[PDB]
RNA sequence: AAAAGGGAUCAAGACAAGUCAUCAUGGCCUAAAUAUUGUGGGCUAUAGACGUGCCACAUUUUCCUAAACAAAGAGAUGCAAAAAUGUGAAUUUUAGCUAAUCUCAAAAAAUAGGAUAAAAAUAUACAAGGAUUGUAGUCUGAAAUUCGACUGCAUGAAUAAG
RNA sequence: AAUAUUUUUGU
């Protein structure tokens, strides 16, 4: 089906196709299948046509897209514009959170970087 | 199946018999500062003094 | 102070406002750990890295946070030449 | 060392028998029972408690339900299972000032019991701070009397049948 | 599992009560009496103790009309402080009738082992010693525990 | 279960080669190593259900297998008796009545 | 340094930083309820947020001295503060060389 | 205790204490090598029923006069009494203040002594010097 | 939204407006507060 | 032929049969199960602990009855006292006997 | 750069949807190497009411096996295919609850019982024998084989207008 | 009962083995400095490479439910019940015990059930995994920025057993 | 009994 311009295969639980969005956990999910009792293991082939809307203009009114990604972006950039130590950190592609760097920096300087990928 | 509002006033009935501060709802009073026991001269008298030679 | 219930750490600056148009020199520090409250937005700082006293202008983006966060103590460590 | 103390075993004990009094056991009005602990000669910080213990049915004054009203204010202090409020005091320096606190108290809480504004009728027993024990003891059922050995001798007999 | 409060969710993200579902709403009323079934019949429900909560409810209702019935003037009450009972389960326990299962008895295993010996399952000869060894192994004859000592074994 | 074992002598075949030479093992010998052949074969072997019944289920179509010949531990279990077979001689090898008896 | 007595007051073995750390030990004695107090107000939300305030600032000023924190066992015998048995005030060595000795009361080799 | 008439029950051997401590051999690195420690407390419990409160005092106040060398003791006296202690205790201050006649002669100190000072303080801050902070 | 933030953890006192900033943190600043600035 | 271990059934105490083949053991060799009432009390250890320590408390006390039946629980493994106990750790080692890794450089 | 070393990256068809869970959820109710047992009686519409069999075994009836198992009476957990014939013990407390229900019945009275016990003593099993009563006498037998599937939440749920009740469609239709 | 087991101990000498940074000590050096005091920083830096450890890469694993069984040690420089409050760290308030008494305190694996599978490679079926980072909090402490330990939400890297 | 891969250096 489609939700939010997203396709999904019938074969796969709604609660993991919400969970697949930028801001969407089991909190969130959790309650947004309570909201038009969809119990947790149903699945997408299972879900009528006028529900699979709703999801759709469900998660249209929250920040579930790059709406997330820009807030975790922004406060980012915003520790390198004011100078701070944890801005170049991101910056250097270094641990951020004070980790000894004799050694294993191996997925801070993969993925800190002032545009993350999320 | 005790209503709460009914069981403060026998915690309150302890409070008075025994003297000890009635808090319902938990405000911090800094009273945690207050029961600890004092350390210090525990600790000054550590290394021994001066004594005959 | 982490914990938001007790307010946060605050230590005695000498940080007296003057007299429209008059000059004030900036502000030399050691306390690192002094919290950036938004009563002095706009005042000079000179916060003491251990050898040096780097310059900052607070801004609202910068409370918050502590002083010592626009100092660093330590040089980028650089392979080669 | 051994002699020194051998020569106070044989010339300086028996003198302690001229100054003993008999035990004589507690009226009808001894329902406190305190303690005091003593480190002989020594100071510790400990030797200041004073832990006192009576029975609520030894208070002859109050009713069933003063009684009762007695152990809802004692709180964790009383036992359910013993049916004894225990209670220690080593707030001040002197063993004497925990005693005499103590002494008071226990006034308190009989003068409190005896207050008819508000008797706690309504409230039940609460005993969640007592962990109650249970313990087994050996089936009365199993007991060879000459009864059983007549039980048994029957159904052994009954079991050789139905193989026969 | 009928008897405490459904893992299901409301549009409030309430969790529902499993008396709540049509379904379970019917056999609950049949079982409490509400629901008479004109033409007779019966409402049997067996517990389980495989895969099981534990509802206080459940438990202590049992023990009330076991107790009633055995002629006791007192019976087991609700604990005065405790929050984990639930007053729907009360009433639908009211004047259920509790049938208590215990191992079986001597002469019931026998008939059993008998059964699985004839069957080649059992390779033992089935006498009294053999009878009164698997209804001790078993806890006083419980009958899923005689199978694991008598036919789940490694021995045979 | 192999009747044999092989046990080799270091760098006695030639240039540094081993001289595998057949050795009998006892009963306890010959049940471990079997038995840990046919758990080589079920731990490759790829899941088919669920339950507590998949690893019992596995190895007991293994045991089948066996009693009816078409298993693949029986390739095994001829591979090791060849060694034995080939190398039947080297029990009175001139290696190993010649080690250090002529200085 | 004022806080360092103008006479030797120590009977151990005296160091450096063993004379620096029994008069960080002096100066929190006659400070601990004064100290306490600050804490106090700092954490009681009852009071006025101008009084915590004040007392918030008033425990900044204190010296170093005055802080608990700063106090740190050491060895009576050597003068060290790694590896210090609050049991017996010595180092981890100085507690062997003298328990096997005897000079230690009840300690014992344990074999078991 | 038995020439006193108190009943004593024991010795009764109650768990020795074991406290242990694994310390390097060397004073230095080699690490590899250490040994263990211990200090093993040996205790007995005499427990006495059905004596005189009076009489057990001077027990245990025998035993404090030819205590042994090497050997703690630590004593629980348990004692009955009315209710009202509060007057009891302030009735029995004559009592007391006669068999302290001929003990009075113990203390001394001038006149007005200054060097005490607040009463209660002077016990408090002693007390602690003698027990060595606690 | 820095400023809001602190607003609501620590209160108003502390912000700059048209008051414990005006004379706390000054009124404990004194001449020689540290030596060696 | 009942056995209460510590008041409940030996079924409702042990889960695993082979513990409740091995406690009643001595009664099993020789045929007895069916004709002594055993009461058991047991403290400390785990389930193997607590089972294998029945076996040889109702074959001493089963001694006390018949003295005749020794020779038969001595070949039944009901009347050795197992003095196997835990290791204690010792200081270099892991655990009582494995060693940390060994760096030859 | 980095000079390590680093490991350089290098079957069957797959079971259908539902094999897996169908595989550990099948009931065998037969063994043909298992023997005859000879004097194995069969039911009757009026057998397991009788005190006399109390302690028989007797076996469970062609027909009636497929009423059981089209409502899930049976359960993995059951040993039933160690032998050939499905057979049951005709247990006291069979008699005792079978005796009720056929009183029940006749005068349109109902009972209300919960079968209550420890773990597998054997209650599951002992529905099974009062639903046998039940197709052997021409009776309707409403059983919900497994009461978590109502409320763990594994199947649709729907709410009622104008009602607190919620309705499960899907489980209703099964 | 018994074919018992473990711990400690394990020499001299050599390695001019290690330690003049525990202590102690001869010679030789510093004595307004190679001594002493405080604030802040550093010892926590990071291209490459080497050691020990934790954990993971799902089918004998993990996950959910339940009415089993330990030993030893700790609390006068203090271990903290019960209750109430909070999703949680934790908070509020102290009953008792300075202890075979009171408290930390609860064993887990296991046993017995139950859930999930094309459980990663056919992309509309991307598994398990929990690193990295964002954010809101709590605890100790003048003080958590360099540089602490935990908690909630979100983010979701490598990793096919080498 | 007649078997035999290679394997340097050390102020
Ligand atoms: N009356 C009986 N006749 C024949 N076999 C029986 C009988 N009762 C029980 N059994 C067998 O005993 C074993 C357990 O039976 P059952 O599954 O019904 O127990 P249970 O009480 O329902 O368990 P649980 O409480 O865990 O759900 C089964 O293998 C069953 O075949
Ligand atoms: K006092
Ligand atoms: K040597
Ligand atoms: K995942
Ligand atoms: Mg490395
Ligand atoms: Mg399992
Ligand atoms: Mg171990
Ligand atoms: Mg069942
Ligand atoms: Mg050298
Ligand atoms: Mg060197
Ligand atoms: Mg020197
Ligand atoms: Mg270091
Ligand atoms: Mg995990
Ligand atoms: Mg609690
Ligand atoms: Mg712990
Ligand atoms: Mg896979
Ligand atoms: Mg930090
Ligand atoms: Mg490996
Ligand atoms: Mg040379």
């Known amino acids: 089906v489609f939700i939010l311009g997203v396709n999904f295969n019938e074969h796969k639980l709604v609660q993991k196709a919400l969970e697949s969005f930028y801001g969407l956990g089991q909190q969130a999910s959790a309650r947004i299948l309570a909201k038009y009792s969809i119990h947790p293991r149903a699945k997408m082939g299972t879900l009528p046509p006028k529900i699979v809307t709703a999801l759709t203009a469900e998660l249209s009114t929250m920040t579930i897209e790059n709406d997330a990604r820009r807030l975790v972006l922004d406060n980012i950039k915003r520790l390198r514009d004011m100078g701070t130590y944890r801005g170049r950190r991101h910056a250097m592609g270094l641990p951020v959170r004070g980790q000894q760097t004799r050694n294993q920096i191996a997925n801070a300087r993969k993925l800190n970087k002032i545009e993350r990928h999320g | 199946s005790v209503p709460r509002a009914r069981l403060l006033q026998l915690v309150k009935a302890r409070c008075e018999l025994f003297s000890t501060t009635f808090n319902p709802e938990g405000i911090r009073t800094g009273n945690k500062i207050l029961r600890q026991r004092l350390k210090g001269p525990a600790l000054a008298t550590y290394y021994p003094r001066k004594n005959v030679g | 102070k982490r914990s938001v219930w007790k307010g946060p750490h605050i230590v005695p600056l000498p940080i007296q406002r003057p007299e429209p148009g008059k000059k004030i020199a900036p502000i030399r520090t050691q306390a690192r750990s002094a919290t950036i409250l938004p009563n002095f937005v706009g005042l000079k700082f000179q916060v003491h890295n251990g050898k040096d006293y780097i310059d900052l202008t607070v801004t609202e983006e910068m409370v918050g946070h502590k002083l010592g966060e626009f100092s660093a103590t330590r040089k980028p460590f650089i392979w080669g030449k | 060392e051994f002699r020194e103390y051998a020569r106070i075993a044989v010339w300086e004990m028996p003198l302690l028998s001229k100054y003993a009094k008999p035990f004589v056991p507690p009226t009808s009005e001894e329902v406190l029972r305190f303690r005091y602990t003593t480190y002989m000669g020594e100071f510790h910080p400990a030797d200041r408690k004073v832990v006192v213990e009576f029975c609520p049915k030894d208070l002859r004054d109050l009713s069933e339900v003063q009684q009762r009203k007695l152990m809802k204010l004692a709180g964790p202090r009383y036992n359910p299972e013993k049916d004894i409020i225990k209670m220690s005091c080593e707030k001040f320096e002197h063993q004497a000032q925990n005693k005499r606190y103590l002494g008071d108290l226990i006034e308190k809480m009989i003068a409190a019991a005896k207050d008819p504004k508000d008797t706690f009728e309504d409230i039940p027993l609460d005993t969640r701070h007592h962990t109650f024990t249970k313990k087994i003891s050996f089936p009365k059922e199993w007991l060879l009397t000459e009864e059983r050995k007549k039980e048994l001798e029957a159904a052994r007999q009954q079991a050789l049948l139905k193989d026969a | 599992h009928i008897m405490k409060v459904s893992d299901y969710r409301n549009p409030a ?144 | 279960a192999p009747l044999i074992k092989m046990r080799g002598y270091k760098g006695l075949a030639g240039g540094g080669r081993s001289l595998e030479v057949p050795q009998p093992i006892p009963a306890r010998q010959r049940r471990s190593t079997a038995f840990k052949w046919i758990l080589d074969v079920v731990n490759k072997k790829p899941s088919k259900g669920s339950g507590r019944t998949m690893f019992a289920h596995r190895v007991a179509e293994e045991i089948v297998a066996v009693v009816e010949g078409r298993s693949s531990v029986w390739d095994k279990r001829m591979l090791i008796h060849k060694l034995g077979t080939a190398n039947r001689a080297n029990l009175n090898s001139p290696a190993l009545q010649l080690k250090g008896k002529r200085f | 340094s004022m806080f360092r007595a103008k006479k030797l007051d120590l009977g151990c073995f005296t160091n450096v930083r063993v004379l620096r750390d029994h008069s960080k030990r002096k100066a929190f004695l006659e400070a601990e309820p004064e100290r306490q107090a600050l804490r106090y107000v700092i954490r009681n939300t009852t009071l006025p947020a101008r009084t915590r305030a004040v007392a918030q600032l008033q425990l900044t000023q204190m010296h170093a001295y005055t802080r608990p924190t700063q106090i740190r066992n050491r060895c009576i015998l050597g003068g060290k503060s790694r590896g210090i048995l609050r049991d017996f005030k010595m180092t981890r060595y100085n507690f062997r060389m003298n328990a096997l000795m005897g000079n230690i009361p009840g300690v014992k080799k344990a074999s078991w | 205790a038995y020439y006193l008439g108190l009943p004593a029950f024991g010795p009764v051997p109650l768990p020795r204490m074991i406290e242990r401590w694994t310390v390097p051999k060397s004073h230095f690195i080699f690490k590899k ?29 025998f035993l404090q006069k030819h205590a042994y060398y090497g050997i703690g003791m630590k004593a629980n006296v348990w004692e009955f009494s009315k209710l009202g202690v509060s007057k009891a205790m302030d009735e029995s201050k004559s009592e007391v203040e006669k068999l302290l006649e001929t003990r009075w002669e113990h203390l001394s100190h001038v006149s007005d002594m200054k060097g005490v000072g607040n009463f209660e303080d002077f016990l408090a801050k002693e007390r602690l010097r003698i027990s060595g902070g606690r | 939204g820095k400023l809001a933030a602190f607003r609501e953890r620590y209160g108003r006192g502390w912000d700059l407006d048209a008051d414990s900033l005006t004379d706390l943190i000054s009124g404990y600043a004194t001449e020689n507060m540290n030596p060696g600035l | 032929g009942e056995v209460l271990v510590n008041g409940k059934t030996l079924a409702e105490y042990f889960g695993r049969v082979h513990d409740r083949e091995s406690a009643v053991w001595a009664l099993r060799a020789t045929n007895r199960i069916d004709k002594y009432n055993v009461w058991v009390k047991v403290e400390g250890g785990g389930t193997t602990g607590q089972a294998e320590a029945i076996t040889l408390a109702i074959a001493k006390a089963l001694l006390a009855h018949e003295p005749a039946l020794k020779p038969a629980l001595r070949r039944a493994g009901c009347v050795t006292r197992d003095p196997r106990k835990v290791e204690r750790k010792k200081h270099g080692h892991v655990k009582a006997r494995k060693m940390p890794t060994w760096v030859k450089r | 750069q980095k000079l390590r070393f680093k490991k350089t990256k290098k079957s069957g068809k797959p079971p259908l949807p539902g094999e897996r869970k169908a595989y550990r959820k099948k009931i065998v109710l037969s063994n043909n190497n298992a023997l005859p047992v000879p004097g194995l009686e069969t039911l009757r519409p009026n057998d397991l009411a009788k005190q006399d069999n109390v302690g028989s075994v007797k076996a469970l009836p062609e027909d009636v096996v497929d009423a059981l198992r089209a409502m899930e009476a049976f359960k993995p957990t059951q040993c039933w295919g160690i032998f050939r014939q499905p057979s049951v013990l005709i247990r006291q407390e069979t008699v005792d609850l079978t005796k009720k229900m056929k009183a029940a019945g006749a005068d349109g009275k109902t009972i209300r019982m919960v079968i209550e016990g420890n773990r597998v003593t054997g209650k599951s099993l002992l529905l099974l024998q009062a639903m046998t009563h039940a197709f052997m006498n021409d009776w309707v037998v409403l059983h919900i084989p497994e009461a978590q599937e109502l409320t763990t939440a594994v199947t649709e749920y729907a709410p009622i207008e104008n009602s607190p009740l919620w309705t499960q469609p899907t489980y209703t239709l099964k």
């Not at chain 5, 009309?65 to 007053?87: F, N, T």
């Open chain 5, 13 to 156: 993200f309430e969790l529902i009560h499993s008396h709540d579902l049509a379904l379970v709403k019917l056999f609950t009323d049949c079982l409490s009496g509400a629901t008479v079934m004109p033409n007779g019949g019966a409402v049997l429900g067996a517990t389980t103790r495989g895969n099981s909560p534990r509802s206080a409810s459940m438990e202590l209702a049992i023990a009330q009309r076991e107790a009633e019935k055995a002629g006791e003037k007192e019976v087991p009450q609700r604990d005065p402080y405790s929050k984990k009972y639930d007053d729907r389960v009360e009433a639908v326990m009211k004047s259920v009738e509790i049938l208590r299962l215990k191992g079986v008895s001597k002469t019931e295993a026998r008939g059993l082992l008998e059964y699985w010996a004839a069957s080649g399952m059992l390779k033992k000869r089935v006498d009294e010693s053999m009878v009164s060894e698997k209804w001790t192994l078993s806890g006083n004859g419980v009958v899923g525990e005689m199978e694991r000592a008598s036919l789940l074994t490694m021995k045979a």
């Open chain 8, 33 to 61: 090598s250490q040994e263990n420690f211990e200090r093993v407390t040996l205790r007995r419990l005499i427990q006495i029923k059905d004596g005189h409160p009076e009489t057990v005092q001077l027990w245990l106040a």
